[PDB]
Amino acid sequence: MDIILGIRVQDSVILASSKAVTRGISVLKDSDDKTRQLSPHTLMSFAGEAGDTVQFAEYIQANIQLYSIREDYELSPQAVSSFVRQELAKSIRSRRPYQVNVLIGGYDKKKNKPELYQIDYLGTKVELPYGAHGYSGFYTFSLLDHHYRPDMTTEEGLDLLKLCVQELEKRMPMDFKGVIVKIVDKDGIRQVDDF
Amino acid sequence: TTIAGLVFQDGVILGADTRATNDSVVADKSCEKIHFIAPKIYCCGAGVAADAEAVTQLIGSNIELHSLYTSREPRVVSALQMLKQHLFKYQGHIGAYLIVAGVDPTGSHLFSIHAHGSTDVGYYLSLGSGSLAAMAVLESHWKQDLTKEEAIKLASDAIQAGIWNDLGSGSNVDVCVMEIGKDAEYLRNYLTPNVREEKQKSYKFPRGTTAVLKESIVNICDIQEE
């Protein structure tokens, strides 16, 4: 899969993920949702090798949902990201590694803070104000470095994200067919249906 | 690396340089390549340093347990057999080249051991990148019924040849002397022919030279009680 972006603002985390699924010669789909809800206040977007991406995401989703039922409690975003990192770090020395890069956007209900975690297929974890995987950061980070403020509203975060996507649409060779955008805050997860 | 071993009148002696190099850079200028196996059994290690050290420690541990079990002082042939069988099992993947020497109830012994598990018996041996330089000295001056004073001289001369003429070897000379009916004497830094000269200048900075963003105290203590 191609472009996955993340930006943590004042009171929410915004994840933007491309809609295209290309199998070599043809674009098979232009409405693909590259994300799974792990818990009510934690969302994970993903990109990497075909098959492995969804298999990994759903496997993580199942384990976090299992934890939620057992303890009657939602794990913090930090705890979920550490669990995800360990599974990827375990994977890299396997017989056949998961080639999957993820962003984990969550709202910590205890601390009342949005949190964004970037984890690559090796199990390299970093907490960031904004992040990306693959070539997405090469185009967008100069704009984010310039315009980003920690006290941005959700609407300002979306406007900065539009500028990032516009720059991607201008300079990237591949047609990624636009992005699905989702917001993670104190009220949970919702999709921005017009972008 | 230059390591050497040779036998004399009523003993055996080991020699080694003290330089560890990864690629072209000197990682360590004073490392110990003469390894302890038993009180009177020692091992010079060449090749991959971690492997040589690890293999001597494992066999040294097993030799100690064997010695306790049998109520006998360990033999060099036991250390030799255990090392070669271990190294053979790993088909050279443990890249240890060793010179094993010691004294035991049987007498004094000197063996070499290669990474694939072949062993040799010798009166004088050398291993490592400096082996050819060291062996030139041993072939020139080694003789039968050497005295201890002559043997230490020859062993250190063999290691020096490696130090000066091999880029892989350098720094100081370590020696270990194992004589019959005596405690083994481990002579670390037996020779020190490569002390650095005094520098031209002092590079100590004025205080406040470095720019600092933040200062904080790190709490390294257990949680306190009130």
Partner: protein
């Protein structure tokens, strides 16, 4: 063959009881009494040693109170050797959780894990159960201060105050009489020692026959601190509370 000699440790009686569990509990009833009391600002663990000897080196001795991590401790009643096998397993589970999630293990999760291990020995394997009852004293950010007990059956329950070992019937009546919900640690310390002093089979309760510990939120600057009491410190608290 071998069948002849098998006691069959994991079977029901005609009444639907697990023989070996019931007999393990009988063993535990002869062990030194351990008491746990939970307060608003901390937990107390008090326990009586059965050594009863002058030459025993008390300051380096540990038979009753063990540390599982920085936030959780246990009081032991039963076979000490059996308890140490389980304690080491619990210590590993806590560190596994910390490695996986980067957060200290919640108290109940640790308790459930150990209790599940005990349960397994009663249902399969043909081995004798662990002759151990634990009092778990711990803290986490979800439920705060918590007391639990587990027994050889693998059943565990939560408590405000509880006893295990000898004279638990008598001990639980005394705790039920004087415990209140708004109680503080200093009051709970006094209750635990007074209860042991009345239920003890010994002629008098002294410092050399006790192990004592507190978990108090009230480490400098809002952190939780475990305090395993030294012999001299047990002697002082006995004089303070007016028992010696």
């Amino acid at each position: 063959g071998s069948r002849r000699y098998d006691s069959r440790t994991t079977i029901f009686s005609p009444e639907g009881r697990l023989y070996q569990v019931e007999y393990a509990l009988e063993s535990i009833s002869h062990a030194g009494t351990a008491i746990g009391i939970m307060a608003s600002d901390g937990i107390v663990l008090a326990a009586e040693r059965k050594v009863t000897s002058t030459l025993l080196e008390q300051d380096t001795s540990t038979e009753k109170l063990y540390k599982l991590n920085d936030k959780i401790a246990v009081a032991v009643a039963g076979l000490t050797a059996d308890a140490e096998i389980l304690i080491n397993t619990a210590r590993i589970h806590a560190q596994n959780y910390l490695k996986t999630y980067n957060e200290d293990i919640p108290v109940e999760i640790l308790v459930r894990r150990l209790s599940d291990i005990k349960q397994g020995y009663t249902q399969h394997g043909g081995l004798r159960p662990f002759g151990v009852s634990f009092i778990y004293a711990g803290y986490d950010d979800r439920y705060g201060y918590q007391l639990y007990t587990s027994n050889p059956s693998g059943n565990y329950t939560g408590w405000k105050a509880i006893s295990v070992g000898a004279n638990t019937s008598a001990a639980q009546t005394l705790l039920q009489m004087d415990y209140k919900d708004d109680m503080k640690v200093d009051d709970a310390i006094e209750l635990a020692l007074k209860t042991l002093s009345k239920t003890t089979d010994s002629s008098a309760l002294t410092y050399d026959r006790l192990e004592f510990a507190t978990i108090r939120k009230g480490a400098n600057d809002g952190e939780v601190y475990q305090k395993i009491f030294k012999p001299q410190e047990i002697k002082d608290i006995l004089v303070k509370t007016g028992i010696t």
